[model samples]
Target chain A: QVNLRESGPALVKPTQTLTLTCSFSGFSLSTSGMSVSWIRQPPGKALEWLALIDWDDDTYYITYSSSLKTRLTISKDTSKSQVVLTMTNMDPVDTATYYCARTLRVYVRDFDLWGRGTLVTVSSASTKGPSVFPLAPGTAALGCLVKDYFPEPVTVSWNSGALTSGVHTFPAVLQSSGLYSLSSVVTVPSSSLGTQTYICNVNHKPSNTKVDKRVEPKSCDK
Target chain B: PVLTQPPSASGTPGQRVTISCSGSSSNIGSNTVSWYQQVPGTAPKLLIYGNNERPSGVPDRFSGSKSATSASLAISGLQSEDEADYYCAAWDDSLNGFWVFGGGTKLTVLGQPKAAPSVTLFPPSSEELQANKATLVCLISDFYPGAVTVAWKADSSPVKAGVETTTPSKQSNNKYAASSYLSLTPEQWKSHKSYSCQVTHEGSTVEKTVAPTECS
Candidate 1:
């Protein structure tokens, strides 16, 4: 049975980036013309196609785009039977239910197979306070909330190199039922930019870095 | 886009009627245009699209012709109002259907108008654009009785509608004329396939097909 699943933060910051992984069971990593596509369901609108990434190095982006670079990225990991996507330039307008899908061929046709989408919100509820200083030039907020499973205190840090500041925190909340909720927050500057990365770490597994998302500001200007 | 009066469209079954499609391209020139018909709630039947493309169930009364980029469709017979939508589709090498509809046209059967009036296509031109589809151009000539609706259809489905008919420029007889560009792929020009250029005047319907073309 070829089963597909997607994992990612249900919430993201407006200036932050989104990283998601889609895995397929009963399938292996074979380039064999298999391509992945990304689509977004804009708030209160029908689904619109974003981009298509294939093994042949051909990427087709839709005309209704805001920037020059890709709003959606598609990559695969044969070892883990998974496909990965990085959507950058987070903004309120970019908020949508992002879906990772596979196409059997590249003949300018439609996609039929899809992974259950992981809804991401470019929101400020994920962290507390501005993660970094100097403040973004625009009106954007930052906050942090908890996640399920993984227990390492996460931190939201702003790299001045990108002309932005954000926070990094890892607070593992333990419930009476013994379930653990992991959370972190990163605040970004409106004038912030660069392909800066936000990293998440686990204390017990200090050597292991779990989540990575890219923050690019160019998408906001356009 | 020649402005011409449409024939009486709505009728009871077995009623005698006429449907005509005018051309921006006249027979004096080689430019061509065509027509098509689509039943509501169903795909378009190849009444005509480009020059001449008769699908499986079309009747022989559905016909086409061209002078330059202008063309027309004339159905000698009229069916009931419940038949379907009727439209005119053009092929201009300059504009591909890629930017527009790729199917047929639909004929809206609105009830008869308050007053009997004439209608015509507006704005005319000679510019041409080519791609993988049919060659097309639009024309506008004035001769109207009321407000005209301009539209594009892809195999019977309406892509865009609500067009402003052109006020014909002074011609030999004081009539006006203009043109525009439309396109179709080589595949679309194949036989048994075509596009339609239809016009509705008052309550009457008329059209032309650009199919059954001999690709030169």
Candidate 2:
């Protein structure tokens, strides 16, 4: 007979991130095929699905698009919904109200008792840089990148110009506006991209809107 | 023992239907109840159970119903959650080893119906959005004296950790009608799940589940 309680701090500093606590009285948060999440909805705003972390540390990040994405890099913790969300590349534009929500990810898309909104903002922290990840020209990976931030979102696609299913494994790391250099690798079939060119396009806020800049994998020959 | 409901109150697609269940004993004190939705080629999702606990990430459009001798499961302003099989099952008393369920009720929202929900929701387009934020009412113009519980199921689960079973009250109409309220956030709502209400007694087991929101 365990009870679930929200135990995280209510107030967070600007530029500083939000840390949530989902305390369980009896049952473990990690049940069969269930994981935790941190959803956000800036003050007086609609819901925003930010980051989806699992009990295994793998996370799926949501794009800034109006629709929520399936790519989440999830992980688990011992304390309550201690799921953390750090907004990197902090600039004047990176600040907006935020929240930390918890959920159980079953069958990939299902999430359930999301918490009330927790407001967070970003400003000057002696740290603000355009988040970037460098590719060594030719990484053989099929991929998609999710930027776990708000406002102007990020988009991901295979350089091979095709729509494929299953999890897209590739070479890239996720980076936040207030955070720094991040990358992870997702694998792509050599035949899919003609063993040549594959590029991952990322769109950010403020300066870059509409047409996003391209992050190309220099060599797909493998 | 098997459960039964008269076909009269059973609703067609887009209609308001109410299915009732009568139980024996044993498992009555245990407030464990579960509802499920089974669509073709998909897995069965937990719709409602444990008195009135909706899981963390489900929607609010779905609700539950209950009484003493019997329990009932209801879905209000039904949307296309799933289009498959719906069933309900409750824990039988440890004294008796019986878990009972009703013959699932098929729900179709695309078609027309005779009796629509007496009270409904507006504003938040989806039940998930209105969750923990609004109130919905289902008015049944009938009356029956029995024991039961009422609550909401967000995405085939309960609204929170603890149960919110309603204390039975008197009805105005010769028929009976009781309104159940659910207080949970949109994040706690589930998609494509059923909502139910079930009752228990001193002897047999009893329960019911809704058919998927859509049917093949």
The digit string of per-residue lDDT tens for model 1 on B1-216 reads 222334335554444444444433322123333343433212222355335544456677666654453445555554433244454433222321111112222332333323322222111111111223233222333333224344544456553532222322222222223322233444543433444556544455555443332324
Candidate 2 local lDDT, residue B203: 32
In model 1 chain A, the worst 10-residue window by lDDT is A128-137
lDDT of 1: 0.41
What fraction of correct interface contacts does each candidate retain?
0.00, 0.00
**Model 2: residues with Cα > 4 Å off, grouped in runs:** A1-222, B3-15, B28-30, B94-101, B110-216
lDDT for residue A88 in candidate 1, whole number 0-100: 77
Q: Give the range where candidate 2 chain A is weakest over 10 consecutive residues by summed lDDT.
A: A166-175
| Error at B51, model 1, angstroms | 23
Best by TM-score: 1
The 0-to-1 C-alpha lDDT of every candidate, in the order given, reads 0.41, 0.38
